[PDB]
Scaffold this active site. Sequence first.
Site, PDB file in Angstrom:
ATOM      1  N   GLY A 151      -7.300  -0.033  -5.964  1.00 54.79           N
ATOM      2  CA  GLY A 151      -7.424  -0.833  -7.161  1.00 54.79           C
ATOM      3  C   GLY A 151      -8.802  -0.807  -7.781  1.00 54.79           C
ATOM      4  O   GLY A 151      -8.995  -1.400  -8.850  1.00 54.79           O
TER       5      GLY A 151
ATOM      6  N   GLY B 211     -10.530   2.180  -8.494  1.00 51.75           N
ATOM      7  CA  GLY B 211     -10.627   3.334  -9.366  1.00 51.75           C
ATOM      8  C   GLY B 211     -11.389   4.470  -8.719  1.00 51.75           C
ATOM      9  O   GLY B 211     -12.178   5.157  -9.374  1.00 51.75           O
ATOM     10  N   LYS B 212     -11.156   4.673  -7.426  1.00 54.52           N
ATOM     11  CA  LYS B 212     -11.818   5.721  -6.668  1.00 54.52           C
ATOM     12  C   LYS B 212     -11.318   7.113  -7.021  1.00 54.52           C
ATOM     13  O   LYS B 212     -12.033   8.091  -6.777  1.00 54.52           O
ATOM     14  CB  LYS B 212     -11.616   5.479  -5.173  1.00 54.52           C
ATOM     15  CG  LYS B 212     -12.263   6.506  -4.275  1.00 54.52           C
ATOM     16  CD  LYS B 212     -12.419   5.990  -2.854  1.00 54.52           C
ATOM     17  CE  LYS B 212     -11.084   5.746  -2.172  1.00 54.52           C
ATOM     18  NZ  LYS B 212     -10.274   6.987  -2.088  1.00 54.52           N
ATOM     19  N   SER B 213     -10.120   7.223  -7.591  1.00 55.29           N
ATOM     20  CA  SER B 213      -9.541   8.506  -7.959  1.00 55.29           C
ATOM     21  C   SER B 213      -9.831   8.856  -9.411  1.00 55.29           C
ATOM     22  O   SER B 213     -10.109  10.016  -9.728  1.00 55.29           O
ATOM     23  CB  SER B 213      -8.034   8.488  -7.713  1.00 55.29           C
ATOM     24  OG  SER B 213      -7.445   9.724  -8.073  1.00 55.29           O
ATOM     25  N   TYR B 214      -9.746   7.865 -10.302  1.00 53.32           N
ATOM     26  CA  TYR B 214     -10.087   8.070 -11.706  1.00 53.32           C
ATOM     27  C   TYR B 214     -11.479   8.674 -11.851  1.00 53.32           C
ATOM     28  O   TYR B 214     -11.709   9.547 -12.695  1.00 53.32           O
ATOM     29  CB  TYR B 214      -9.989   6.738 -12.448  1.00 53.32           C
ATOM     30  CG  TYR B 214     -10.305   6.790 -13.926  1.00 53.32           C
ATOM     31  CD1 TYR B 214      -9.296   6.934 -14.864  1.00 53.32           C
ATOM     32  CD2 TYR B 214     -11.606   6.663 -14.384  1.00 53.32           C
ATOM     33  CE1 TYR B 214      -9.577   6.970 -16.214  1.00 53.32           C
ATOM     34  CE2 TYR B 214     -11.898   6.700 -15.729  1.00 53.32           C
ATOM     35  CZ  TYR B 214     -10.880   6.853 -16.641  1.00 53.32           C
ATOM     36  OH  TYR B 214     -11.168   6.885 -17.986  1.00 53.32           O
TER      37      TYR B 214
ATOM     38  N   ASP C 246     -13.454  12.018   0.719  1.00 58.16           N
ATOM     39  CA  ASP C 246     -12.760  10.818   0.271  1.00 58.16           C
ATOM     40  C   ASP C 246     -12.539   9.974   1.516  1.00 58.16           C
ATOM     41  O   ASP C 246     -11.771  10.346   2.410  1.00 58.16           O
ATOM     42  CB  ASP C 246     -11.453  11.174  -0.420  1.00 58.16           C
ATOM     43  CG  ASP C 246     -10.806   9.988  -1.111  1.00 58.16           C
ATOM     44  OD1 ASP C 246     -10.848   8.868  -0.562  1.00 58.16           O
ATOM     45  OD2 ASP C 246     -10.244  10.178  -2.209  1.00 58.16           O
TER      46      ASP C 246
ATOM     47  N   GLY D  90     -10.343   2.925   3.068  1.00 57.37           N
ATOM     48  CA  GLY D  90     -10.860   1.551   2.933  1.00 57.37           C
ATOM     49  C   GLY D  90     -10.940   0.868   4.279  1.00 57.37           C
ATOM     50  O   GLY D  90     -10.147   1.247   5.141  1.00 57.37           O
TER      51      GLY D  90
HETATM   52  N1  ANP Z   1     -13.908   3.760 -15.321  1.00 57.04           N
HETATM   53  C1  ANP Z   1     -12.698   3.382 -15.737  1.00 57.04           C
HETATM   54  N2  ANP Z   1     -12.534   3.050 -17.037  1.00 57.04           N
HETATM   55  C2  ANP Z   1     -11.325   2.673 -17.458  1.00 57.04           C
HETATM   56  N3  ANP Z   1     -10.191   2.562 -16.763  1.00 57.04           N
HETATM   57  C3  ANP Z   1     -10.382   2.897 -15.482  1.00 57.04           C
HETATM   58  C4  ANP Z   1     -11.568   3.307 -14.896  1.00 57.04           C
HETATM   59  N4  ANP Z   1     -11.393   3.571 -13.548  1.00 57.04           N
HETATM   60  C5  ANP Z   1     -10.120   3.318 -13.350  1.00 57.04           C
HETATM   61  N5  ANP Z   1      -9.450   2.907 -14.471  1.00 57.04           N
HETATM   62  C6  ANP Z   1      -8.038   2.554 -14.573  1.00 57.04           C
HETATM   63  O1  ANP Z   1      -7.635   1.994 -13.338  1.00 57.04           O
HETATM   64  C7  ANP Z   1      -6.743   2.893 -12.647  1.00 57.04           C
HETATM   65  C8  ANP Z   1      -7.154   2.991 -11.202  1.00 57.04           C
HETATM   66  O2  ANP Z   1      -6.782   4.283 -10.697  1.00 57.04           O
HETATM   67  P1  ANP Z   1      -5.354   4.545 -10.074  1.00 57.04           P
HETATM   68  O3  ANP Z   1      -5.435   5.803  -9.301  1.00 57.04           O
HETATM   69  O4  ANP Z   1      -4.256   4.510 -11.140  1.00 57.04           O
HETATM   70  O5  ANP Z   1      -5.106   3.315  -9.111  1.00 57.04           O
HETATM   71  P2  ANP Z   1      -6.000   3.175  -7.846  1.00 57.04           P
HETATM   72  O6  ANP Z   1      -5.685   1.903  -7.134  1.00 57.04           O
HETATM   73  O7  ANP Z   1      -7.496   3.166  -8.269  1.00 57.04           O
HETATM   74  N6  ANP Z   1      -5.742   4.473  -6.824  1.00 57.04           N
HETATM   75  P3  ANP Z   1      -6.702   4.256  -5.452  1.00 57.04           P
HETATM   76  O8  ANP Z   1      -8.150   3.840  -5.914  1.00 57.04           O
HETATM   77  O9  ANP Z   1      -6.770   5.604  -4.629  1.00 57.04           O
HETATM   78  O10 ANP Z   1      -6.121   3.173  -4.601  1.00 57.04           O
HETATM   79  C9  ANP Z   1      -6.790   4.205 -13.424  1.00 57.04           C
HETATM   80  O11 ANP Z   1      -5.545   4.890 -13.354  1.00 57.04           O
HETATM   81  C10 ANP Z   1      -7.119   3.744 -14.843  1.00 57.04           C
HETATM   82  O12 ANP Z   1      -5.961   3.339 -15.562  1.00 57.04           O
END
Ligand code: ANP
Lengths: 367, 365
Positions: free
Chosen positions: B95, B97-100, B248, B251
Amino acid sequence: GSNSQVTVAVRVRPFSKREKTEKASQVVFTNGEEITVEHPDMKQVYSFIYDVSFWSFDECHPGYASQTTVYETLAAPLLDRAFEGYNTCLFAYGQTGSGKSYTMMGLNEEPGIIPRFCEDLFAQIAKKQTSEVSYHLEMSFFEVYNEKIHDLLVCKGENGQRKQPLRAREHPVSGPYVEGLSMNVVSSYSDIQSWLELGNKQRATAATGMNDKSSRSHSVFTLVMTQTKTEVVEGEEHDHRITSRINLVDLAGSERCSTAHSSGQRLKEGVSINKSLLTLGKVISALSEQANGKRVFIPYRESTLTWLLKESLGGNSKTAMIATVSPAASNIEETLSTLRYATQARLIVNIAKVNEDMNAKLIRELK
Amino acid sequence: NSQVTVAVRVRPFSKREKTEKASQVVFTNGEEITVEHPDMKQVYSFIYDVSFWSFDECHPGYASQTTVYETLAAPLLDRAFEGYNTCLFAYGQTGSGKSYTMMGLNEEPGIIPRFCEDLFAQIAKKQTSEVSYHLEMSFFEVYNEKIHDLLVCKGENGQRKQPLRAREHPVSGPYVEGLSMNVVSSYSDIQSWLELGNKQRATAATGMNDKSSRSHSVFTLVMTQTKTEVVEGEEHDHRITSRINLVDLAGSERCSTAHSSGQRLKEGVSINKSLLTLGKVISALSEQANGKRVFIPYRESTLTWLLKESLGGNSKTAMIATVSPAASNIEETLSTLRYATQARLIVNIAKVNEDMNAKLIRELK
Ligand SMILES: Nc1ncnc2c1ncn2[C@@H]1O[C@H](COP(=O)(O)OP(=O)(O)NP(=O)(O)O)[C@@H](O)[C@H]1O
Ligand SMILES: Nc1ncnc2c1ncn2[C@@H]1O[C@H](COP(=O)(O)OP(=O)(O)NP(=O)(O)O)[C@@H](O)[C@H]1O
Ligand SMILES: [Mg+2]
């Protein structure tokens, strides 16, 4: 703020059916503006001076002081001060059948200070209803009965035991107040009239020897007038705010338990009224002695009326009172007591100020 | 000679949180970051070498994907082509945003694609008849202190998690025995291999998510430079190598609130342990860079032991910790912040900024 004195006025009502039936001699006379009293003993003639005198005894003589006149002489200045931002108080005083529930509220054909003040206030506000200053009005209408508080603008439920009592409480800054009072919002004079009619229908009244409809409960009519003024500031506007309170009070009467022959509830409420008035007299004398530089304590706490009107008798408000007296010989003692309390109320002063309500925000400090 | 570049990225709200009006607890003052509880009791302050405040698109210094890349990752390419090894660690609770940040979307790419494509571009620019470049790749995972490969096909069995071993070559340092290595020429090949592997990476639907990572993923690129020099004859074989590692991490997660028995508990324990050893090694590396005499415990965990030659020495390490600003995730947020910190946490208490309007104290003065 600066020192300002309590405006004392007097009104001599005309003979009633009782004083006419048991034919009595006229004793109260106005020497122009002084009010003189010629005792039947004829040991002396007392003479009292007041800021204003009203002679509504005759209906012909030059000097006839009608309801509109009493308004334009006493209540309109308080409206000026309320628009200036000061709190204002007006309270009636006198014995039974003197015309306190008439001077203030009046009949459907001769309205009193309350309706005239409310109408004039709303009309002046409509006249001045520019985009600079936004106005807001709230009202309350409560009473005091056997030392218990009751709300008049709250319709009784489906029972007789419906006089659900409230209680008073001291806010450390704003002073005393009533807990649970249904303050209502005021758009205009028609809604004011409707609320007031409901209130007077709920108020405690009864018949007796010296009145067919006498008030057995003190009544307080409170207005809160808020002026939010617009101003060109480099940031957010509408910080300038003036909140002023108008408090109009119809008290009950002395009533000796012989003329107004009573038994039971009538007597009990007659006793409570009498005690409240005693405490009021003590407060007035104490403030008068304060005005002469002595050290005195004011027994506000000995009764709920003085407790809830603490900030008005002294405190911070432009205060006025209307004494009511009869012209007959049978009420000479009560007339003299009332006139003495009236004249020693004139020496009272109170520190009224504009309620800017900007302490420790920016503006009272910049001042 | 080395130094750890620590960066922290605070994501913005999502649509769900904006709908629910989830409150904000992470704030910025330039470089410093703060956490102010909703109870108005304590104010924690963190400093990091770099911050990326992706909360509002309007604020000055809003960290774009290009800003993050050009600030954290791209100098690693400079050191690589200079002939030095590089490691980039990614940490953050789900949650955050480690992948984004790292891999990214199809429209808003991340560190991995910007890195690889810029690498290909610089290679195409430096390619001549005298110098040539060669790129091999590998992709392994760590699970309960055991190694597995992510680039093989699961055989016809109930499970084909074939474990492997680690071994210490006296010259090349440690390595993984039997790991497959493939050659690459384009990001198409890199992306294909990664998309194959991340289907095999161990993942389970815990309480916090439907897909939470339970293995440490290592993505390695070995880049060999073949140059020539006059030796009074055929100019031949002046060889340099550099190793890029992209890690990577998983957690932490406490097991006292998140009631969890069995394999989940074992997984969480091993994750927690590996992260502890990683923090010890990182702090030891910081002290070594600051000039103390330090012993680095590479051998107390598989990941550290395998990445030994890419953290110590004349190598460049970077860490990116991702956090969320919402209040509901505050325990995870404070934990990740404390983990990413290297010098010290600062703590105060303050409720005196609300000066009743427009800084009342000024007119008082
Ligand atoms: N820097 C950012 N700016 C804007 N939106 C962001 C940013 N980082 C993340 N997001 C949003 O938040 C989501 C988080 O990534 P997502 O992979 O969908 O869920 P996640 O929980 O982060 N996956 P994970 O971190 O491996 O558990 C992204 O898909 C974007 O929609
Ligand atoms: N100026 C006046 N002209 C004619 N009648 C008057 C006048 N003032 C008062 N009255 C009469 O006074 C009577 C009762 O007056 P009222 O308002 O009840 O005095 P009061 O002080 O309220 N009595 P109480 O309820 O014990 O306080 C009414 O029936 C009126 O007719
Ligand atoms: Mg009355």
